[PDB]
Amino acid sequence: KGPVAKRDVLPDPIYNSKLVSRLINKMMIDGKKGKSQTILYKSFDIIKERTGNDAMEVFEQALKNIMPVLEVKARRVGGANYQVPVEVRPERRTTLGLRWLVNYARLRGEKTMEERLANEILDAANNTGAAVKKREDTHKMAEANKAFAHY
Amino acid sequence: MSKTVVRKNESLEDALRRFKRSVSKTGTLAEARKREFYEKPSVKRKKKSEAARKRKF
Amino acid sequence: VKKNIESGIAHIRSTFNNTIVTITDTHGNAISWSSAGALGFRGSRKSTPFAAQMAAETAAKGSIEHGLKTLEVTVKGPGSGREAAIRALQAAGLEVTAIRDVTPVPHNGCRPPKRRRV
Amino acid sequence: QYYGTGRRKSSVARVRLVPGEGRIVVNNREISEHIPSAALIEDIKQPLTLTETAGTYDVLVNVHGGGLSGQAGAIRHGIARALLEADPEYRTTLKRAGLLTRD
């Protein structure tokens, strides 16, 4: 066996970014990529409107904040069910950040996914945020499981 | 424990390199490690004839 | 008032269940000590190389205030933590001086107890 | 009259790259007349931007079959294929894209 390759589509006129393209690929339901594209466009527009700054930098800072450095992987060595901290590769970090962003944004609850994602990007740029709660919990678990930094 | 001989002007692991090699010629790994639980006289005697000859260690 | 010992000796006891770090002077007087249980490791993680590393680090950073500049190693006992222990002892900055061939090797002694399967 | 076929997911782009100014006809329609959501319009010209062929060739196509996205993909694929068959000088550059998927 072994790993496998893959690729995506970068070009996006509204805040061109490969991570933005990956996010667009995410949050998509029922094969409706157009809905996700429109939602992301309108959310970035609302961000640019409310905050006098380019949404690209805000999104980058939100990703830098939510990205988890250490992952806590379970492992059952005997009747103990231990856990092992793990160093997350940048790809897995970005994917986990996207997952948490989307999930907690849709979990927040507002009148529109656009406003939900906008407020989530804001509460991510400002470390105080839902996805950052998940980040902090994961970091706490990794710290508590530091005893198994390496087998 | 390897020995009382001191070595300086090397790296940190250069000392462990010779530690793990010189500890073989001492009972620290066999004499002080076998007697963790009792062994009956019969098996105690057969263990030598087995190991010291088969060269399994 | 504090006897500022220049150099001392460290006795380390490694085991499959715990690791103890003791730092002493030339006469063996207890200067500082730490163990995995003190670090926080309560389960079988006590005897881990990482736990031994943390215990040695704590002992070294505790004796640094006591003043000894260099120390001697007198590790002893089974276990794999004896490597990380000395690694942390060296990384702490307190250079080691020498070592000894001491060990509890008995000639015959008393017979150990019954195995863990009968 | 350079010709090409942008076969992609049942959507065929019967493209004939003839020397023109840069007009792109889709089933006898205009770009905006046919395809809203211009996010894909800029993507169609990906190879047209990789190689400088801005306004020297016209694109008259009769795209039959497939949705909007599949039609745009077939259009750009046929454009690339016809452009390569016309001038293979930049085939070394366009081999890193290909756009052939057998979808």
From Swiss-Prot, chain A:
The record's listing under PROSITE patterns reads:
RIBOSOMAL_S7
InterPro entries membership: Ribosomal_uS7 (IPR000235), Ribosomal_uS7_bac/org-type (IPR005717), Ribosomal_uS7_CS (IPR020606), Ribosomal_uS7_dom (IPR023798), Ribosomal_uS7_dom_sf (IPR036823)
- Write down any Gene Ontology CC term: ribosome
Keywords annotated in UniProt: Ribonucleoprotein, Ribosomal protein, RNA-binding, rRNA-binding, tRNA-binding
A GO molecular function held by the record: tRNA binding
Q: Name one Pfam family in it.
A: Ribosomal_S7
Which biological process, per GO, is one annotated for this protein?
ribosomal small subunit assembly
Quaternary structure annotation from Swiss-Prot or TrEMBL: Part of the 30S ribosomal subunit. Contacts proteins S9 and S11. Interacts with VmlR.
Checking HAMAP family in the record gives: Ribosomal_uS7_B (MF_00480_B)
What does this chain do?
Answer: One of the primary rRNA binding proteins, it binds directly to 16S rRNA where it nucleates assembly of the head domain of the 30S subunit. Is located at the subunit interface close to the decoding center, probably blocks exit of the E-site tRNA.
* PANTHER family the UniProt entry points to: RIBOSOMAL PROTEIN S7
Family as reported in the entry's similarity comment: Belongs to the universal ribosomal protein uS7 family.
Put simply, this protein is called Small ribosomal subunit protein uS7
Swiss-Prot record, chain B:
Pfam families found in the cross-reference section:
Ribosomal_S21 (PF01165)
Sorted alphabetically, which InterPro entries does this protein's record hold?
A: Ribosomal_bS21 (IPR001911), Ribosomal_bS21_CS (IPR018278), Ribosomal_bS21_sf (IPR038380)
Q: Which domain of life is it from?
A: Bacteria
Q: Name one GO cellular component term.
A: ribosome
Provide a Gene Ontology MF annotation, just one.
structural constituent of ribosome
| Database matches in Gene3D superfamilies | Ribosomal protein S8
Q: Would you tell me the protein name for this molecule?
A: Small ribosomal subunit protein bS21
Q: List the taxonomic lineage.
A: Bacteria, Bacillati, Bacillota, Bacilli, Bacillales
Swiss-Prot record, chain C:
Q: Give the source's domain of life in one word.
A: Bacteria
Report TM segments.
none
Entry-linked InterPro entries: Ribosomal_uS11, Ribosomal_uS11_bac-type, Ribosomal_uS11_CS, Ribosomal_uS11_sf
UniProt keywords (A-Z) are: Ribonucleoprotein, Ribosomal protein, RNA-binding, rRNA-binding
Under the GO molecular function aspect, what terms does this record hold? rRNA binding; structural constituent of ribosome
Q: Which SUPFAM superfamilies match?
A: Translational machinery components
The record ties this protein, via Gene3D superfamilies, to:
Ribosomal protein S11
- Keyword Ribosomal protein applies: yes
Q: Name one GO cellular component term.
A: cytosolic small ribosomal subunit
Biological process terms from the Gene Ontology for this record are: translation
Tell me which PANTHER family the record gives: 40S RIBOSOMAL PROTEIN S14/30S RIBOSOMAL PROTEIN S11
Q: What is the protein's quaternary organization?
A: Part of the 30S ribosomal subunit. Interacts with proteins S7 and S18. Binds to IF-3. Interacts with VmlR. Interacts with BrxC.
Task: Describe the family membership recorded for this protein in Swiss-Prot or TrEMBL.
Answer: Belongs to the universal ribosomal protein uS11 family.
Q: What does this protein do?
A: Located on the platform of the 30S subunit, it bridges several disparate RNA helices of the 16S rRNA. Forms part of the Shine-Dalgarno cleft in the 70S ribosome.
Protein name (record): Small ribosomal subunit protein uS11
What species was this sequence derived from? Bacillus subtilis (strain 168)
Gene expressing this chain: rpsK
UniProtKB/Swiss-Prot annotation, chain D:
Which GO biological process entries does UniProt record here? translation
Q: Which GO terms describe its cellular component?
A: cytosolic small ribosomal subunit
What are this entry's molecular-function GO terms?
RNA binding; structural constituent of ribosome
Q: Which UniProt keywords apply?
A: Ribonucleoprotein, Ribosomal protein
Record keyword Ribonucleoprotein present: yes
What top-level branch of life does the organism fall under? Bacteria
How the protein assembles, per its UniProt entry?
Part of the 30S ribosomal subunit.
Q: Which family does it belong to?
A: Belongs to the universal ribosomal protein uS9 family.
Q: What is this protein called?
A: Small ribosomal subunit protein uS9
What is the organism of origin for this protein? Bacillus subtilis (strain 168)
What gene is it encoded by? rpsI
